[PDB]
Each structure stands twice: as C-alpha cells, then as structure tokens.
C-alpha cells in the first residue's frame, strides 16, 4: 500500500504535483458527473438552495502505470489527496471522501463530496406551473482550452439516487446538457452548464398564502350579493375584505421578494377589489347586485388559466 | 530539456528566490494594472448596507527576476498551487481559485475571487433622482508610494457580466474610475475606486408600495359622496407597518413623505365631517405638483 507506492512516485520517478502531467500534451479531458445525496432548502426570497453532489472525474495520467500487482480496484489512502494533480474546479454560484480507482493505462476515477449552495435566477413566466431553469456550472479557472477541457459522460450523466423525496417539486427526467464557454482577457475558460427543467407545485401555498387569498375572493362573492339597505351589514363587513387583504399582501411581502415585472400570482388580488370600489359610488344613487359579479369574474377566470398554463 | 528543472531555475532550491522581499529591491515602485469583473448580483441590503457579489481581481505587473530564456512559449499559465512561494501584492477592500502567468519579459497575471458582500454607503433622499451608488476601494496596507502604486487600466478594465440581470434596479454601463488615495500615520496608500450607479424603472415600489397606497386614495374619497374614515386610516396604519419590512431608521425623511401625505388627507375628511369635489381635487393639484420635481 505504501512500501512500493511512494518510493516509485516521488523518489525514483519524481511525480511533480505542482505542474500538470504529460508535458507538451493535448488538453486532458474529463468525464465529470453528479450524484445526488439530497436536494432541499429551496428559498424563494433570497432565491438560493443547497444541493449535495458526489463528484467523480476521469483523466488519463501516464504516471499511473503499474506492473507488480494484478488488482484494479485501488482506492488509496486519504493522506495523498494533495500529492496528485487536481483540475482547477470552481463553482460559479458557490476521512477524506476521495475514492480513486486507477487503471493500468492511467484511467483515474477520483471522487469528491461537495454540498454546494447554488443560486437560481427566477424570471417569471407562470410561477405556479413554470419550468424554471436553475443553472449548475462546472467551471475551470487556472487553465485555458489548450490545457484542460471538461465533458460529461456519455451514458447517464445526470442522475438522482434511489427514490429520495423532494420538498415541493419533482424533477423531469429530460434535462439540458449544453456546452457553453466563458471568455476572459487571459483566455477562454471551461463552461459546463446543466439546465434544470425544474417545476414547483402549489402544495405549500394551497394552505398558506394565496389560495387563502381566494378566501377573500370567495368572500368577494358575498360582499356584493347583499342589497343596499344595510349599512353595518354590507360595508360593515365590506371594510373587512380590504383590511384582510392587507394581512395577506404582507404575506406577499414577507415570504415573497420584490421582482422586476408585475407578479402573475398577485394580479388577481387587486382586480377582485377593483369591482367593489365602483359599487360604493352607487350609494349616492338589486338584480345586478344579485347576478352580476359571479358572471363577471368567471369570464376571466377560465380565460386566464388557458394562456398561462404553458 | 528538463521540464522539472525549469521550476528550479527561478525559484525553489536554487537561485535564491524569496517571497519575503520586494522585487527590484532598492529601485522603482512596482506598479500593478488591475481589472475587475463582477459575477453574481444579489441581496441589496438597505438595512445592513450590504451588497453581495464576487469579483475576479486580475492584476498585471512586472517582475525582473521572474524571466526565462529557455522555452519558446511566451504566455504560459500555471496552477494555483504555487503562490505560497510567489510574490503577491497586499489587496483588501476598505469597504469590507487562481492562475499564474509567467511571461518572457516578466509580466505576472494573478486573479482571485474576492468572496465579499460589499458594504455600501448610499443616500436615500428620493430614489427617482437619488441614484444608488456603491463604492468599493482597492487600497493596500503594507507599502507606501515608494514601493507599490495602484491604478486602473486605461483600456476599459471594468465591465459588467453579459447575462447579468438584476431585481428592483437597473445597472448602467458608464462609471467613474478616479482616485481615492489615502493618508495614514504609517504613510500614504494607493486607493482606487469605482461607482456602480443604480437607478430604477418607472417604479416597482410604485406597484409594490404606492399602488396599495393609491388604492386607498380612491378608497379614502368614497366618504365624500365614521366607520369608513377610521377604517381607511387604520388601513394606512397597516400599510405603514408594511412599509417597514427591512427599511432602516433613517434620521432624515424618505420619498415616507408619500405615506405621510396620504396619511394626512385621510383624517382631514373626517374632521371636515366633524365640522365633495373640492377636497379630492385638492390632492390632484398637489399630486400633479408632486411628480414634476422627480424628473431630475
């Protein structure tokens, strides 16, 4: 394990770890991939989340040739994690667990465990039922295209473990594995984007915030059916439906951040109050009060969800 | 050709290299030429003065004894695992992952990611004309003018990321690259700064904060045409509680004057009731007078 390893590595051969091996060589490719331990902690205010990754990467190092032992599964001791050549991995939205399976030609399969704290820029298209691209970039910094290039593996590059639960999302099996490239003023660097086809479902806020904002909308079906001969019984509870809105518009401020375009969820908050704010003028002035408003929002309620389900 | 003795010829065991001394000792001050690149926008903190972003800090200088006359390649890069015995300048920020180029003449490029939520002293007089400005200063600590000089590069060394979007704000392209140079008891230091101007569109807190207050402006007027006026000032009381989510305790008043001009006129109708067109149109002659000033 160490009697013939270190003497044939640094003393008699001189594995110079502070340079890349195969001097005057092609850029040494990798086949990098992920393996999920757990997702979770997807925040929506600060738009950040945490993902645990089992990395494992490949290369072809010509200073990993053996002739004595016939074995193949050769996970070494974790003390020599810094005596090898490591590609300059950084992350763009940022016992040793290092199981390395070398070969005779030099196919090293070096593993890394990282619990990363990625970010997802949310552009609103239809936030209740969107497909949200949360990027995940394998990035290199010290080396250019002439020295190091990253690739995925061919069969099963992105995968999830054995049926682990997911907090208020499910991920589609189809994903996107495009080959971007970043450009800087010392050379172009390695970009490996993994676009996540990531949806989210209303199962949290079916009970929490904006489905209880339809508790105001179903109360908006009540504060107009009553006739105009009741001052403490129609606007006596009709002043409630605008202060109850302020208790849940803070719910769209506490657990919701500020965005650029107008919110697709919060657009039916004000237009339900927009009807009753013109009927309060008619006190100075009953069949329309009975039938009109349930035949005034259903013409838009069926029209809204057909367009914004894509 | 000895590819392992190339590293030994300039540093390591032979040639007497030491990172504990200034390059070209008893000589001119070694200037650097910096260039920055922001990466990730996020979390404008008006409470804790913060601004979260990580930046590539690349700098070009000259080193006399870091030259070579052996290999024909000019711009050869290295791994980051060598900088513990490589000269580096003293960089930090007063408002508070590498590569190593070794050129033939002696030029050395060195870029790290400063992972730092930048502190931001901003003014909040009136945000449609008071443009938000965060200032980051690259002033050193270990050397005076006679040993180390900082400056920006003239070719446009500062730039914004390409696919960078930003919430609540917009980010401009042009910016100032002047000096901010310091004067301490140790000596005088080399400060360099940039100004990231941040303004808005025509109001998202129009929609977020002012439209729920403007929804009360129509709602406070329907008493003209006791339980209504006290409820709407209670609604203005609730919107005043919603207007202090993460806002600081600023000694001066904010463009707070829009909440106060609608909090003032909502009980003026009820004391007039205690005493139909003229009072709601008295707001519109001031509301049109309000928005003229803010186009500066």
């Amino acid at each position, epitope marked *: 394990p160490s009697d013939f390893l270190d003497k044939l590595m640094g003393r008699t051969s001189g594995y110079d770890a502070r340079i890349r091996p195969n001097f*005057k*060589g*092609p*850029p040494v490719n990798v086949s990098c991939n992920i393996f999920i331990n757990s997702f979770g902690s997807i925040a929506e205010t600060t738009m950040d989340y945490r993902v645990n990754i089992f990395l494992r990467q490949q290369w072809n190092d010509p200073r990993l040739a053996y002739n004595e032992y016939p074995d193949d599964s050769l996970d070494l001791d974790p003390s020599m994690l810094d005596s090898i050549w490591k590609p300059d991995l950084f992350f763009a939205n940022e016992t040793d667990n290092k199981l390395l399976r070398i070969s005779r030609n030099g196919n090293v399969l070096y593993s890394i465990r990282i619990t990363l704290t990625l970010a997802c820029p949310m552009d609103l298209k239809n936030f209740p039922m969107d497909v949200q691209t949360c990027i995940m970039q394998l990035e290199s910094f010290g080396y250019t*295209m*002439n020295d190091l290039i990253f690739e995925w593996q061919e069969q099963g590059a992105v995968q999830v473990a054995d049926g682990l639960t997911l907090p208020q999302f499910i991920l589609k099996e189809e994903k996107d594995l495009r*080959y971007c*490239t970043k*450009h800087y*003023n010392t050379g*172009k660097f390695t970009c490996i984007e993994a676009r996540f086809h990531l949806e989210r479902q209303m199962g949290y806020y079916l009970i929490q915030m904006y489905i209880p904002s339809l508790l105001i909308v179903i109360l908006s079906w009540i504060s107009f059916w009553i006739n105009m001969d009741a001052a403490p019984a129609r606007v006596g509870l009709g002043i409630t439906t605008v202060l109850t809105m302020t208790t849940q518009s803070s719910g769209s401020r506490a657990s919701l951040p500020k965005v650029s375009y107008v919110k697709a969820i919060d657009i039916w908050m004000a237009v339900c109050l927009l009807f009753v704010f013109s009927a309060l003028l008619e006190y100075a002035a009953d069949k329309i009060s009975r039938i009109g408003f349930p035949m005034a929002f259903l013409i838009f309620n069926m029209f809204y969800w057909i367009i914004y389900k894509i | 050709m000895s590819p392992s003795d190339f590293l030994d010829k300039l540093m390591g065991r032979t040639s007497g290299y030491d990172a504990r001394i200034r390059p070209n000792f008893k000589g001119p001050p070694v200037n650097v030429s910096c*260039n920055i690149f922001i990466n990730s926008f996020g979390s404008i903190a008006e409470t804790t003065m913060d601004y979260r972003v990580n930046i590539f800090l690349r700098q070009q200088w000259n080193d006399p004894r870091l030259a070579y006359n052996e290999y*024909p*390649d*000019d*711009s050869l890069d290295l791994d980051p695992s060598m900088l513990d015995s490589i000269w580096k300048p003293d960089l930090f920020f007063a408002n508070e992952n590498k590569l190593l180029r070794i050129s033939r003449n002696g030029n050395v490029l060195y870029s790290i990611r400063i992972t730092l939520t930048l502190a931001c002293p901003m003014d909040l007089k009136n945000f449609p004309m008071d443009v938000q400005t965060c200032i980051m200063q690259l002033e050193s600590f270990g050397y005076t003018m006679n040993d180390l000089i900082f400056e920006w590069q003239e*070719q*446009g*060394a500062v*730039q*914004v990321a*390409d*696919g960078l979007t930003l919430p609540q704000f917009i980010l401009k*392209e042009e910016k100032d690259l002047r000096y901010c140079t310091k004067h301490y008891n140790t000596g005088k230091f080399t400060c360099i700064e940039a100004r990231f101007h941040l303004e808005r569109q025509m109001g998202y807190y129009l929609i977020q904060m002012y439209i729920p207050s403007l929804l009360i402006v129509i709602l406070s007027w329907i008493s003209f045409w006791v339980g209504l006026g006290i409820t709407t000032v209670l609604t203005m009381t609730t919107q005043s509680s919603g207007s202090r989510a993460s806002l600081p305790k600023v000694s001066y008043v904010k463009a707070d004057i829009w909440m106060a001009v609608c909090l003032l006129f909502v009980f003026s109708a009820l004391l007039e009731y205690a005493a139909r067109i003229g009072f709601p149109m008295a707001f519109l002659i001031f509301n049109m007078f309000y928005w003229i000033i803010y186009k500066i």
Partner: antibody, heavy 115, light 103 residues
Framework: VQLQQSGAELMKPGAAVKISCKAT????????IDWLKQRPGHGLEWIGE????????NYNEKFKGKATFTAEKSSNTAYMQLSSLTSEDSAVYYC???????????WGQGTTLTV | IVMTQSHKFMSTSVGDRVSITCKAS??????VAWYQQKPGQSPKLLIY???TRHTGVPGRFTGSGSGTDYTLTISSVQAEDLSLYYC?????????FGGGTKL
C-alpha cells in the same frame, strides 16, 4: 446564431475602411469576435481577437498600427478600422466567432475589399 | 512562427485515401486544425484537435497525426468536395494558417 456583414465597398488608396459584423440571436459582447483576412495568391494570416465588453486585444507583431479595432454595445455589431491602404487590400474579410476554442466554427459571408 | 505544408501540389483520385502533412517552425503541440472551405464561398472547419469534429458534417473523415508528423486522411474521395484545406496550429499566440498544396 447568424453573423451578418455589410455589402460591397470600394475605397481610395490611403483612406480608411469601416466594416461591421451584425450578430443576431445573442448579445454582441458575449463571445470573442475574431477577424480574419483571406487574401489569394499566397497563404493566409492572423489579425487578432477582441472582447466587445472591455476592448482588450492581442495584435500580430507585423500588424501593430495597421489593424485597429472598435466595438459597440448599442448597435450590436463589431467594427474594424484600417490605415495606409496599399495594394495588399485585395482580400475577403471575415468575422469569426470561435466559441469553445481558438479555432473557428462560425463565420461570415465575406466582404469584398480591394485597392 | 509559420505553418508550412509539404509541397505546392498533390494528386487526386476518386475513392482513395490521402495522406498530407503540415509542419510548423518548431514542434509546438498536437493542435491540428484543418478548415473546410470551397472556391467561392465562406470557409468552415472539419477537424479540430486532430480527432474531434463539428456537427452537421460529412462523416467520411479520419483525422490522425501527432507531434512532428501530422496526417489528414479521407476515407473515400467524394466528387462534390474537390477543394483545398488549411492547416492551423492553435497553441501559440500567432495563429498561422496553411500555405496550400493543390490536390
């Protein structure tokens, strides 16, 4: 991704040549836009690449002063400036965009210049 | 810095394999770049880094060669692609193209 250039143009000797390179589909300051000169008779030659967001460049040693670059974000194009138009202007100009290497896959349709 | 081919003229025959070499001023790297052009239109590439290939391509290409001896080998000679190709090294900062050896 489409790299659209301008039409044909004829210039006097000793003048300057201004050509553009329209890039539709993505932003103009995203990738490297390198310029090549395709002159017949002999082999070809390298000019130098620029980043349209900053303006940093790497000139050829024989072409310092002869080839100067200009960039612009608002017009979504990349520019090119020349000087001292001698008889070696009979060439076809290209604006390549090699994304994942210093080799080049995307190209323009070509712009005809001669003196 | 130069990128010099073997000769100024080759010979062609339908349905064979060619072997053209391209050298540099020094032994630089294995950064082989042959460019797919035709007389009249704009150039493209066929082979980069001596083994890899751009999408949307005739798949009759067998790139080889390394070190001081580069080799571009067609599998079968077509009749619709009778054109000359340009060798490049792309490791040093001068990006010198090829000279020309007319097939």
């Amino acid at each position: 991704v489409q790299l659209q250039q301008s039409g044909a143009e004829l210039m006097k000797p000793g003048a300057a040549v201004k050509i553009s390179c329209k890039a539709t589909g993505h932003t103009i300051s995203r990738y490297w836009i390198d310029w090549l000169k395709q002159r017949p008779g002999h082999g070809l030659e390298w000019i130098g690449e620029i980043l349209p967001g900053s303006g940093s460049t790497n000139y050829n040693e024989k072409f310092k002063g002869k080839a100067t670059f200009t960039a612009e974000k608002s017009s979504n194009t990349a520019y090119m400036q020349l000087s001292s138009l001698t008889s070696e202007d009979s060439a076809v100009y290209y604006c390549a965009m090699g994304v994942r290497g210093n080799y080049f896959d995307y190209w323009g349709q070509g712009t005809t210049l001669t003196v | 810095i130069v990128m010099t081919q073997s000769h100024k003229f080759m010979s062609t025959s339908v349905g064979d394999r060619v072997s053209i070499t391209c050298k540099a001023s020094q032994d630089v790297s294995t950064a082989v770049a042959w460019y797919q052009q035709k007389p009249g239109q704009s150039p493209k590439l066929l082979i980069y880094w001596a083994s890899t290939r751009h999408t949307g391509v005739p798949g009759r290409f067998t790139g080889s060669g390394s070190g001081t001896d580069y080799t571009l080998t067609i599998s079968s000679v077509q009749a619709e692609d009778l054109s000359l190709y340009y060798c490049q090294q792309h490791y040093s900062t001068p990006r010198t193209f090829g000279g020309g050896t007319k097939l």
